[PDB]
mmCIF file of C-alpha atoms and ligand atoms in Angstrom:
data_model
loop_
_atom_site.group_PDB
_atom_site.id
_atom_site.type_symbol
_atom_site.label_atom_id
_atom_site.label_comp_id
_atom_site.label_asym_id
_atom_site.label_seq_id
_atom_site.Cartn_x
_atom_site.Cartn_y
_atom_site.Cartn_z
ATOM 1 C CA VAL A 1 0.540 9.226 -31.300
ATOM 2 C CA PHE A 2 2.500 7.586 -29.836
ATOM 3 C CA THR A 3 2.568 3.565 -29.728
ATOM 4 C CA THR A 4 5.069 1.347 -27.478
ATOM 5 C CA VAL A 5 5.422 -2.137 -25.147
ATOM 6 C CA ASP A 6 8.325 -1.253 -22.676
ATOM 7 C CA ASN A 7 7.366 3.030 -22.307
ATOM 8 C CA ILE A 8 11.325 3.353 -22.757
ATOM 9 C CA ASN A 9 11.202 3.477 -26.742
ATOM 10 C CA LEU A 10 8.436 5.371 -27.988
ATOM 11 C CA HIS A 11 6.982 4.833 -32.036
ATOM 12 C CA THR A 12 4.959 7.937 -33.464
ATOM 13 C CA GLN A 13 2.421 7.085 -36.442
ATOM 14 C CA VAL A 14 -1.360 8.728 -36.918
ATOM 15 C CA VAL A 15 -5.059 7.654 -36.598
ATOM 16 C CA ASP A 16 -7.939 8.124 -39.009
ATOM 17 C CA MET A 17 -10.899 9.550 -37.140
ATOM 18 C CA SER A 18 -13.366 7.115 -38.321
ATOM 19 C CA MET A 19 -11.379 3.854 -37.703
ATOM 20 C CA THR A 20 -11.086 2.034 -34.066
ATOM 21 C CA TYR A 21 -7.839 1.355 -32.739
ATOM 22 C CA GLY A 22 -7.957 -1.972 -33.387
ATOM 23 C CA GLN A 23 -8.109 -2.115 -37.276
ATOM 24 C CA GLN A 24 -5.188 0.322 -37.207
ATOM 25 C CA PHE A 25 -2.555 -0.763 -34.289
ATOM 26 C CA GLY A 26 -3.915 -3.959 -33.166
ATOM 27 C CA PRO A 27 -5.313 -4.818 -29.251
ATOM 28 C CA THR A 28 -4.337 -0.998 -27.871
ATOM 29 C CA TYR A 29 -4.331 -0.034 -24.206
ATOM 30 C CA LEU A 30 -4.526 3.468 -22.407
ATOM 31 C CA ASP A 31 -3.569 3.705 -19.009
ATOM 32 C CA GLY A 32 -4.696 0.405 -17.998
ATOM 33 C CA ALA A 33 -7.877 0.527 -20.320
ATOM 34 C CA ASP A 34 -8.480 -1.016 -23.267
ATOM 35 C CA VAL A 35 -8.975 1.475 -26.242
ATOM 36 C CA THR A 36 -9.530 -0.880 -28.998
ATOM 37 C CA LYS A 37 -12.899 -0.871 -29.153
ATOM 38 C CA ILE A 38 -12.926 2.495 -28.621
ATOM 39 C CA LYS A 39 -12.511 4.897 -32.116
ATOM 40 C CA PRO A 40 -10.046 7.778 -31.683
ATOM 41 C CA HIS A 41 -11.689 10.951 -29.803
ATOM 42 C CA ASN A 42 -8.669 13.159 -31.546
ATOM 43 C CA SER A 43 -8.976 14.979 -28.227
ATOM 44 C CA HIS A 44 -5.788 13.555 -27.717
ATOM 45 C CA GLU A 45 -2.840 13.960 -30.081
ATOM 46 C CA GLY A 46 1.001 12.225 -29.349
ATOM 47 C CA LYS A 47 -0.494 10.452 -26.535
ATOM 48 C CA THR A 48 1.501 7.136 -25.500
ATOM 49 C CA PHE A 49 -0.113 4.032 -25.913
ATOM 50 C CA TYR A 50 0.325 0.314 -25.531
ATOM 51 C CA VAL A 51 -0.066 -2.201 -27.898
ATOM 52 C CA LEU A 52 0.879 -5.681 -27.983
ATOM 53 C CA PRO A 53 4.154 -6.461 -30.176
ATOM 54 C CA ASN A 54 3.572 -6.741 -33.798
ATOM 55 C CA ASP A 55 6.912 -6.482 -35.371
ATOM 56 C CA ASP A 56 9.990 -8.073 -34.493
ATOM 57 C CA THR A 57 11.958 -4.954 -33.434
ATOM 58 C CA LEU A 58 8.661 -4.814 -30.927
ATOM 59 C CA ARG A 59 8.685 -8.478 -29.851
ATOM 60 C CA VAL A 60 12.324 -7.890 -29.038
ATOM 61 C CA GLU A 61 11.721 -4.272 -26.912
ATOM 62 C CA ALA A 62 9.112 -6.461 -24.992
ATOM 63 C CA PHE A 63 11.482 -9.057 -24.091
ATOM 64 C CA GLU A 64 14.311 -6.685 -23.333
ATOM 65 C CA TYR A 65 12.107 -4.976 -21.054
ATOM 66 C CA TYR A 66 9.739 -8.436 -19.657
ATOM 67 C CA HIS A 67 11.816 -10.777 -19.990
ATOM 68 C CA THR A 68 9.297 -13.419 -21.454
ATOM 69 C CA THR A 69 7.785 -13.781 -25.050
ATOM 70 C CA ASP A 70 4.048 -15.002 -23.874
ATOM 71 C CA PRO A 71 1.879 -12.667 -25.488
ATOM 72 C CA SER A 72 -0.960 -13.255 -22.917
ATOM 73 C CA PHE A 73 1.751 -11.336 -20.721
ATOM 74 C CA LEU A 74 1.005 -7.274 -22.032
ATOM 75 C CA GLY A 75 -3.179 -8.042 -21.880
ATOM 76 C CA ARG A 76 -2.987 -9.877 -18.143
ATOM 77 C CA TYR A 77 -0.529 -6.753 -17.015
ATOM 78 C CA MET A 78 -2.793 -4.074 -18.399
ATOM 79 C CA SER A 79 -5.859 -5.863 -16.957
ATOM 80 C CA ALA A 80 -4.614 -5.841 -13.623
ATOM 81 C CA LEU A 81 -3.406 -2.276 -13.633
ATOM 82 C CA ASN A 82 -6.303 -0.810 -13.966
ATOM 83 C CA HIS A 83 -7.724 -1.903 -10.487
ATOM 84 C CA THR A 84 -4.078 -1.646 -8.926
ATOM 85 C CA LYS A 85 -4.373 2.289 -10.303
ATOM 86 C CA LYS A 86 -6.947 3.252 -7.820
ATOM 87 C CA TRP A 87 -6.083 1.372 -4.499
ATOM 88 C CA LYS A 88 -4.549 3.712 -1.586
ATOM 89 C CA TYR A 89 -0.901 2.824 -1.021
ATOM 90 C CA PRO A 90 -0.488 4.644 2.643
ATOM 91 C CA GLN A 91 2.746 4.733 4.183
ATOM 92 C CA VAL A 92 2.991 3.206 7.747
ATOM 93 C CA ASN A 93 6.244 3.290 9.404
ATOM 94 C CA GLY A 94 8.543 4.285 6.928
ATOM 95 C CA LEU A 95 6.907 1.623 4.632
ATOM 96 C CA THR A 96 4.648 1.506 1.535
ATOM 97 C CA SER A 97 1.605 -0.379 2.329
ATOM 98 C CA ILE A 98 -2.140 -1.011 0.268
ATOM 99 C CA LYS A 99 -5.372 -0.227 1.908
ATOM 100 C CA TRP A 100 -7.090 -3.709 2.054
ATOM 101 C CA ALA A 101 -9.244 -3.915 -1.253
ATOM 102 C CA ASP A 102 -10.225 -6.846 -3.755
ATOM 103 C CA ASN A 103 -8.546 -9.605 -1.558
ATOM 104 C CA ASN A 104 -5.050 -7.572 -1.306
ATOM 105 C CA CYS A 105 -3.902 -8.985 1.924
ATOM 106 C CA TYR A 106 -0.896 -11.209 0.689
ATOM 107 C CA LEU A 107 -0.157 -8.277 -2.117
ATOM 108 C CA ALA A 108 0.446 -6.337 1.046
ATOM 109 C CA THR A 109 2.361 -8.547 2.789
ATOM 110 C CA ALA A 110 4.628 -9.249 0.056
ATOM 111 C CA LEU A 111 4.997 -5.642 -0.669
ATOM 112 C CA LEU A 112 6.258 -4.602 2.913
ATOM 113 C CA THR A 113 8.345 -8.000 2.971
ATOM 114 C CA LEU A 114 10.224 -6.720 -0.432
ATOM 115 C CA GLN A 115 10.837 -3.360 1.454
ATOM 116 C CA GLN A 116 13.159 -5.131 3.989
ATOM 117 C CA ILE A 117 14.858 -7.783 2.333
ATOM 118 C CA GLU A 118 17.623 -7.351 -0.246
ATOM 119 C CA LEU A 119 16.504 -8.173 -3.686
ATOM 120 C CA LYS A 120 17.600 -7.116 -7.695
ATOM 121 C CA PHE A 121 15.339 -8.120 -10.190
ATOM 122 C CA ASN A 122 16.152 -9.406 -13.644
ATOM 123 C CA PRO A 123 13.295 -8.009 -15.806
ATOM 124 C CA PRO A 124 13.913 -4.200 -16.259
ATOM 125 C CA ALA A 125 10.249 -3.486 -15.660
ATOM 126 C CA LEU A 126 10.363 -5.020 -12.390
ATOM 127 C CA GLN A 127 13.567 -3.517 -10.868
ATOM 128 C CA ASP A 128 12.140 -0.257 -12.314
ATOM 129 C CA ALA A 129 8.736 -0.583 -10.419
ATOM 130 C CA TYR A 130 10.358 -2.029 -7.581
ATOM 131 C CA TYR A 131 12.553 1.540 -7.308
ATOM 132 C CA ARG A 132 9.025 3.742 -7.924
ATOM 133 C CA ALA A 133 7.191 1.164 -5.166
ATOM 134 C CA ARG A 134 9.587 1.978 -2.633
ATOM 135 C CA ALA A 135 9.064 6.228 -3.387
ATOM 136 C CA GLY A 136 5.308 5.306 -2.406
ATOM 137 C CA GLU A 137 3.814 4.377 -6.169
ATOM 138 C CA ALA A 138 3.652 0.656 -6.274
ATOM 139 C CA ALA A 139 0.334 0.492 -8.694
ATOM 140 C CA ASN A 140 2.380 -0.998 -11.597
ATOM 141 C CA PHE A 141 4.320 -2.864 -9.608
ATOM 142 C CA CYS A 142 1.580 -4.773 -7.854
ATOM 143 C CA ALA A 143 0.447 -5.113 -11.167
ATOM 144 C CA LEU A 144 3.710 -6.854 -12.525
ATOM 145 C CA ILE A 145 3.761 -8.995 -9.312
ATOM 146 C CA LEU A 146 -0.086 -9.965 -10.591
ATOM 147 C CA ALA A 147 0.984 -11.024 -14.366
ATOM 148 C CA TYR A 148 4.661 -12.812 -13.460
ATOM 149 C CA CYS A 149 2.318 -14.844 -11.065
ATOM 150 C CA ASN A 150 -0.293 -15.406 -13.581
ATOM 151 C CA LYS A 151 -3.037 -14.250 -11.185
ATOM 152 C CA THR A 152 -5.759 -12.007 -11.043
ATOM 153 C CA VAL A 153 -7.243 -9.481 -8.907
ATOM 154 C CA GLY A 154 -9.535 -10.727 -6.151
ATOM 155 C CA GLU A 155 -7.975 -13.981 -6.718
ATOM 156 C CA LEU A 156 -6.808 -15.522 -3.315
ATOM 157 C CA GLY A 157 -2.906 -15.588 -3.059
ATOM 158 C CA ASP A 158 -0.507 -17.240 -0.761
ATOM 159 C CA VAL A 159 2.182 -15.547 0.400
ATOM 160 C CA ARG A 160 5.167 -17.936 0.525
ATOM 161 C CA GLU A 161 4.348 -18.833 -3.220
ATOM 162 C CA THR A 162 4.209 -15.267 -4.385
ATOM 163 C CA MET A 163 7.352 -14.677 -2.906
ATOM 164 C CA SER A 164 8.934 -18.116 -4.484
ATOM 165 C CA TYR A 165 7.817 -16.860 -7.757
ATOM 166 C CA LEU A 166 9.298 -13.766 -7.543
ATOM 167 C CA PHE A 167 12.567 -15.443 -6.390
ATOM 168 C CA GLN A 168 13.067 -16.781 -9.587
ATOM 169 C CA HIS A 169 12.947 -13.440 -11.550
ATOM 170 C CA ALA A 170 15.863 -12.251 -9.201
ATOM 171 C CA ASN A 171 19.513 -12.851 -9.354
ATOM 172 C CA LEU A 172 19.484 -15.150 -6.268
ATOM 173 C CA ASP A 173 22.769 -16.628 -8.444
ATOM 174 C CA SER A 174 25.008 -15.880 -5.694
ATOM 175 C CA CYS A 175 23.221 -17.718 -2.943
ATOM 176 C CA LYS A 176 24.145 -20.877 -1.841
ATOM 177 C CA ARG A 177 23.083 -23.227 1.290
ATOM 178 C CA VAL A 178 24.962 -26.485 1.842
ATOM 179 C CA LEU A 179 22.948 -29.046 3.649
ATOM 180 C CA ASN A 180 24.023 -32.669 5.382
ATOM 181 C CA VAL A 181 21.933 -34.941 6.497
ATOM 182 C CA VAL A 182 23.048 -38.371 8.553
ATOM 183 C CA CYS A 183 21.378 -41.633 8.992
ATOM 184 C CA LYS A 184 23.211 -44.195 10.973
ATOM 185 C CA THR A 185 22.040 -46.992 8.529
ATOM 186 C CA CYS A 186 22.607 -45.068 5.008
ATOM 187 C CA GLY A 187 25.618 -43.011 6.484
ATOM 188 C CA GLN A 188 26.024 -38.960 5.740
ATOM 189 C CA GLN A 189 25.403 -37.587 2.554
ATOM 190 C CA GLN A 190 26.075 -33.796 1.719
ATOM 191 C CA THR A 191 23.854 -32.058 -0.688
ATOM 192 C CA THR A 192 24.227 -28.519 -2.243
ATOM 193 C CA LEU A 193 21.327 -26.321 -2.750
ATOM 194 C CA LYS A 194 21.603 -22.955 -4.938
ATOM 195 C CA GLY A 195 19.331 -20.026 -6.062
ATOM 196 C CA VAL A 196 15.683 -20.253 -4.991
ATOM 197 C CA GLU A 197 16.093 -23.581 -3.208
ATOM 198 C CA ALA A 198 18.650 -21.778 -1.228
ATOM 199 C CA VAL A 199 17.033 -19.146 0.492
ATOM 200 C CA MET A 200 13.328 -21.224 0.951
ATOM 201 C CA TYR A 201 12.795 -23.873 3.133
ATOM 202 C CA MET A 202 9.143 -25.362 4.157
ATOM 203 C CA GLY A 203 8.843 -27.122 7.640
ATOM 204 C CA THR A 204 10.058 -24.513 10.766
ATOM 205 C CA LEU A 205 9.529 -20.867 11.045
ATOM 206 C CA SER A 206 12.624 -20.783 13.423
ATOM 207 C CA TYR A 207 16.404 -20.297 11.656
ATOM 208 C CA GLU A 208 18.247 -21.734 14.720
ATOM 209 C CA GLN A 209 15.742 -25.234 14.743
ATOM 210 C CA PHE A 210 17.202 -25.530 11.241
ATOM 211 C CA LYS A 211 20.301 -24.694 12.631
ATOM 212 C CA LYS A 212 20.116 -27.271 15.246
ATOM 213 C CA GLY A 213 18.726 -29.987 13.399
ATOM 214 C CA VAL A 214 15.356 -30.908 11.703
ATOM 215 C CA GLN A 215 13.669 -34.465 11.168
ATOM 216 C CA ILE A 216 13.025 -35.519 7.800
ATOM 217 C CA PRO A 217 12.570 -39.371 6.498
ATOM 218 C CA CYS A 218 15.683 -41.272 4.776
ATOM 219 C CA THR A 219 15.155 -44.046 2.394
ATOM 220 C CA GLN A 220 14.490 -40.581 10.653
ATOM 221 C CA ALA A 221 17.303 -38.892 9.545
ATOM 222 C CA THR A 222 18.255 -35.611 10.638
ATOM 223 C CA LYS A 223 18.429 -32.242 8.054
ATOM 224 C CA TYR A 224 20.990 -29.346 9.630
ATOM 225 C CA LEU A 225 22.297 -26.171 7.699
ATOM 226 C CA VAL A 226 25.659 -26.394 7.055
ATOM 227 C CA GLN A 227 26.711 -23.171 4.916
ATOM 228 C CA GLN A 228 24.394 -20.091 4.041
ATOM 229 C CA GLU A 229 25.565 -17.600 1.641
ATOM 230 C CA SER A 230 22.489 -15.236 1.344
ATOM 231 C CA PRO A 231 21.791 -11.808 2.004
ATOM 232 C CA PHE A 232 18.236 -13.513 3.598
ATOM 233 C CA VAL A 233 16.171 -16.508 4.603
ATOM 234 C CA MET A 234 12.854 -17.418 4.207
ATOM 235 C CA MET A 235 11.481 -19.806 6.648
ATOM 236 C CA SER A 236 8.081 -20.931 6.120
ATOM 237 C CA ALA A 237 5.594 -23.398 8.126
ATOM 238 C CA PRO A 238 1.695 -24.217 8.155
ATOM 239 C CA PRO A 239 0.349 -21.781 10.208
ATOM 240 C CA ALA A 240 0.883 -22.429 13.765
ATOM 241 C CA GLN A 241 1.435 -20.702 17.227
ATOM 242 C CA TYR A 242 4.150 -19.014 17.161
ATOM 243 C CA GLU A 243 5.952 -16.191 19.729
ATOM 244 C CA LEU A 244 7.877 -13.477 17.992
ATOM 245 C CA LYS A 245 10.512 -11.882 20.068
ATOM 246 C CA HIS A 246 11.338 -8.233 19.324
ATOM 247 C CA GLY A 247 15.339 -8.559 17.439
ATOM 248 C CA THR A 248 15.399 -12.258 16.673
ATOM 249 C CA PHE A 249 13.937 -11.534 13.181
ATOM 250 C CA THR A 250 13.476 -9.114 10.311
ATOM 251 C CA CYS A 251 9.589 -9.377 9.571
ATOM 252 C CA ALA A 252 6.982 -11.944 9.533
ATOM 253 C CA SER A 253 3.602 -12.827 7.989
ATOM 254 C CA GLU A 254 0.607 -13.692 10.260
ATOM 255 C CA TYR A 255 -2.137 -15.773 8.715
ATOM 256 C CA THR A 256 -5.352 -16.234 10.645
ATOM 257 C CA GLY A 257 -8.451 -18.040 9.017
ATOM 258 C CA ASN A 258 -9.636 -21.113 7.512
ATOM 259 C CA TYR A 259 -7.028 -22.140 4.403
ATOM 260 C CA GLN A 260 -7.303 -20.344 1.531
ATOM 261 C CA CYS A 261 -9.918 -17.636 2.766
ATOM 262 C CA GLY A 262 -7.696 -16.550 5.541
ATOM 263 C CA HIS A 263 -6.547 -13.450 6.027
ATOM 264 C CA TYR A 264 -2.692 -12.062 5.725
ATOM 265 C CA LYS A 265 -1.035 -9.383 8.486
ATOM 266 C CA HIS A 266 2.659 -8.320 8.668
ATOM 267 C CA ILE A 267 4.908 -8.043 11.594
ATOM 268 C CA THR A 268 7.878 -6.313 11.598
ATOM 269 C CA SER A 269 11.222 -5.755 14.339
ATOM 270 C CA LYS A 270 11.885 -2.451 14.968
ATOM 271 C CA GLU A 271 12.916 -0.682 18.225
ATOM 272 C CA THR A 272 9.573 -2.489 19.182
ATOM 273 C CA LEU A 273 7.035 -4.998 17.338
ATOM 274 C CA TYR A 274 4.663 -3.351 15.079
ATOM 275 C CA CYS A 275 1.809 -5.051 12.989
ATOM 276 C CA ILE A 276 0.996 -3.552 9.894
ATOM 277 C CA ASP A 277 -2.529 -4.512 8.744
ATOM 278 C CA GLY A 278 -3.251 -2.412 5.412
ATOM 279 C CA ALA A 279 -3.798 0.779 6.239
ATOM 280 C CA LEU A 280 -3.780 0.391 10.415
ATOM 281 C CA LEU A 281 -0.809 -0.214 12.189
ATOM 282 C CA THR A 282 -0.433 -1.868 16.119
ATOM 283 C CA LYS A 283 2.484 -1.825 18.145
ATOM 284 C CA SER A 284 3.468 -3.782 21.113
ATOM 285 C CA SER A 285 6.772 -5.378 23.266
ATOM 286 C CA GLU A 286 5.732 -8.554 22.213
ATOM 287 C CA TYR A 287 3.516 -10.836 19.836
ATOM 288 C CA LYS A 288 2.232 -14.279 19.869
ATOM 289 C CA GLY A 289 -0.405 -15.414 16.868
ATOM 290 C CA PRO A 290 -0.740 -17.428 14.188
ATOM 291 C CA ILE A 291 2.608 -17.405 11.869
ATOM 292 C CA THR A 292 3.434 -19.240 8.837
ATOM 293 C CA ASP A 293 6.409 -17.422 7.110
ATOM 294 C CA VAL A 294 9.404 -15.815 9.125
ATOM 295 C CA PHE A 295 11.880 -13.594 7.331
ATOM 296 C CA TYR A 296 15.668 -13.837 8.761
ATOM 297 C CA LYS A 297 18.585 -11.508 7.719
ATOM 298 C CA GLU A 298 22.277 -12.973 7.024
ATOM 299 C CA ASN A 299 25.469 -12.454 5.150
ATOM 300 C CA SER A 300 27.583 -15.921 5.590
ATOM 301 C CA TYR A 301 26.827 -18.645 7.948
ATOM 302 C CA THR A 302 29.509 -21.665 8.418
ATOM 303 C CA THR A 303 28.412 -24.761 10.989
ATOM 304 C CA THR A 304 30.134 -25.604 14.321
ATOM 305 C CA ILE A 305 30.633 -29.158 14.917
HETATM 306 C C1 XYR B 401 -5.094 -18.069 1.237
HETATM 307 C C2 XYR B 401 -4.080 -19.144 0.480
HETATM 308 C C3 XYR B 401 -4.126 -18.926 -1.323
HETATM 309 C C4 XYR B 401 -3.741 -20.000 -2.167
HETATM 310 C C5 XYR B 401 -3.490 -21.124 -1.441
HETATM 311 O O1 XYR B 401 -3.121 -21.741 -2.687
HETATM 312 C C6 XYR B 401 -2.647 -22.982 -2.290
HETATM 313 C C7 XYR B 401 -2.503 -23.828 -3.220
HETATM 314 N N1 XYR B 401 -1.168 -23.850 -4.189
HETATM 315 C C8 XYR B 401 -0.600 -24.893 -4.313
HETATM 316 C C9 XYR B 401 -1.752 -22.856 -5.398
HETATM 317 C C10 XYR B 401 -3.296 -21.025 -0.603
HETATM 318 C C11 XYR B 401 -3.527 -20.236 1.055
HETATM 319 C C12 XYR B 401 -3.613 -20.405 2.245
HETATM 320 O O2 XYR B 401 -4.101 -20.714 3.159
HETATM 321 N N2 XYR B 401 -2.118 -20.526 2.589
HETATM 322 C C13 XYR B 401 -2.032 -20.575 4.100
HETATM 323 C C14 XYR B 401 -0.556 -20.266 4.440
HETATM 324 C C15 XYR B 401 -2.313 -21.969 4.342
HETATM 325 C C16 XYR B 401 -3.172 -22.262 5.261
HETATM 326 C C17 XYR B 401 -3.002 -23.715 5.601
HETATM 327 C C18 XYR B 401 -4.275 -24.274 6.578
HETATM 328 C C19 XYR B 401 -4.533 -25.186 7.181
HETATM 329 N N3 XYR B 401 -5.527 -25.158 8.041
HETATM 330 N N4 XYR B 401 -5.959 -23.644 7.703
HETATM 331 C C20 XYR B 401 -7.493 -23.700 8.513
HETATM 332 C C21 XYR B 401 -5.401 -23.203 6.803
HETATM 333 C C22 XYR B 401 -2.557 -24.221 5.265
HETATM 334 C C23 XYR B 401 -1.123 -24.244 4.386
HETATM 335 C C24 XYR B 401 -0.412 -25.687 4.099
HETATM 336 C C25 XYR B 401 0.250 -26.546 4.441
HETATM 337 N N5 XYR B 401 1.139 -26.788 4.364
HETATM 338 N N6 XYR B 401 1.072 -26.165 3.201
HETATM 339 C C26 XYR B 401 2.339 -26.644 2.020
HETATM 340 F F1 XYR B 401 2.622 -28.193 2.180
HETATM 341 F F2 XYR B 401 2.081 -26.743 1.123
HETATM 342 C C27 XYR B 401 0.973 -24.923 3.381
HETATM 343 C C28 XYR B 401 -0.933 -22.862 3.850
HETATM 344 CL CL1 CL B 402 14.640 -14.771 -18.964
HETATM 345 CL CL1 CL B 403 14.131 -13.445 -15.168
HETATM 346 CL CL1 CL B 404 17.249 -10.817 11.532
HETATM 347 ZN ZN1 ZN B 405 12.038 1.363 -31.011
HETATM 348 ZN ZN1 ZN B 406 15.156 -13.090 -17.124
HETATM 349 ZN ZN1 ZN B 407 -11.131 -3.896 -8.180
HETATM 350 ZN ZN1 ZN B 408 -10.622 -1.346 -8.267
HETATM 351 ZN ZN1 ZN B 409 -7.166 -10.486 3.015
HETATM 352 ZN ZN1 ZN B 410 18.690 -44.430 5.314
#
């Protein structure tokens, strides 16, 4: 048979029918199911298998595809895939969603959001699954998202936290946010953020109000945006009522329920406002509801006065 870790480079070996896979290879998975305890059925010859890296060439191949040396990563990924490959991934309004199952509401909103913003992932396994997800096959993408966030199937997830984990594995080096806070006592201090901190802010959902001025305490001073060089901006705030106006944003995440046990729903702005709840779709002209994250498009911004 064949054993690999990246599925790009394969290594051919043979198995004895009377010895279980673990003694010959180590922890071995097939199609997301652990075949370590299973003895070789001999029904499949030449089939590709996933093994935890043992050699040094395997360890190096594993990092070049995943960008991690954690030995637990492969196991956490294969156990997530075992669930995600039986989920349904319908296509709603030209976007790939997820039929609700095992509290994946936060995963679906993230998947729909990632298909609407410009992003490039540094780990090749993430980028390759990102492409496959856009086409309509996102089982490996959702499993990798769980493994990189160290989350499990059924576990309760927050969209803002999931996006920030994903942003740290993406090339946001070109992004830049220049801030300036002014206090009548301390004066004026100019700070310059870069990377994940340049595309995310917690406090308001309104990109305008962030450009206008938000009130943060000083050692209350006012914080306003001065320059933004990012393909997008994520505006996060604790869940509250908000009126989404058609054409003033890209997409938003709605959270309705109690802390940690509420349900996420996704709103996107097209020719009208659309609401995606897994496999369901809802259309309206304007939206008002509990909103916690709003995504805006951007290329370059420079403050005036
Ligand atoms: C679903 C889930 C899954 C996991 C999860 O983990 C959080 C813990 N992490 C550190 C691991 C959180 C959540 C979760 O409910 N998220 C939503 C958007 C939410 C809801 C509420 C809320 C308040 N009252 N009610 C009825 C709801 C408040 C906040 C909040 C406030 N401040 N902030 C920020 F300042 F931090 C965040 C966030
Ligand atoms: Cl890395
Ligand atoms: Cl990385
Ligand atoms: Cl926008
Ligand atoms: Zn090789
Ligand atoms: Zn990396
Ligand atoms: Zn399941
Ligand atoms: Zn399942
Ligand atoms: Zn849910
Ligand atoms: Zn001060």
